[PDB]
């Protein structure tokens, strides 16, 4: 799930950009954290397929899209650092 936001630069990070970042990052991690909380067994993991992007700010005015997508790459090492490794498995797909 994503919002189409365009024309939003660094000087025009607006309500749509904040809400899109909320959808794409902070409640995306909340679905994963809630599925982690509703699981009781370490034998049935959920393979989260993360829509990563290969263009982290290399394009122009997209709002917080690059900020939303580069912050999903933290789950690759947060898989090791936290207690949901056997609970969620991260499989980031870099869509071209």
């Amino acid at each position: 799930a994503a919002i189409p936001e365009n024309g939003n630069g660094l000087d025009n990070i607006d309500s749509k950009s904040e809400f899109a970042h909320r959808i794409m990052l902070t409640n995306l991690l909340r679905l994963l954290g809630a599925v982690k909380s509703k699981k009781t067994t370490d034998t049935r993991p959920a393979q989260c397929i993360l829509p990563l992007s290969p263009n982290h700010g290399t394009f122009g005015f997209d709002g917080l899209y690059s900020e939303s997508k580069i912050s999903l790459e933290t789950l690759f090492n947060r898989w090791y650092s936290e207690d949901w490794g056997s609970k969620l498995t991260v499989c980031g797909a870099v869509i071209g």
Partner: protein, 63 residues
């Protein structure tokens, strides 16, 4: 001219009688108005804390 002057004194007598009757019955003739004023300013307080959210976040985020 003078018809309105006498109508005004008739209604003046009616008001002075209504206040005496409301005093006799211990009726707060403005309790509704005072409560409306005190709950309309509470609406102002909640609107002040509500518009903080919309100023801080925006219309799109709020909707």
């Amino acid at each position: 001219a003078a018809l309105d002057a006498l109508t005004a004194e008739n209604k003046k007598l009616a008001k002075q009688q209504l206040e005496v009757l409301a005093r006799y019955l211990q009726v707060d003739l403005n309790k509704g108005a005072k409560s409306f004023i005190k709950e309309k300013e509470a609406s102002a307080v909640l609107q002040k804390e509500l518009d903080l959210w919309e100023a801080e976040h925006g219309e799109f985020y709020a909707k």
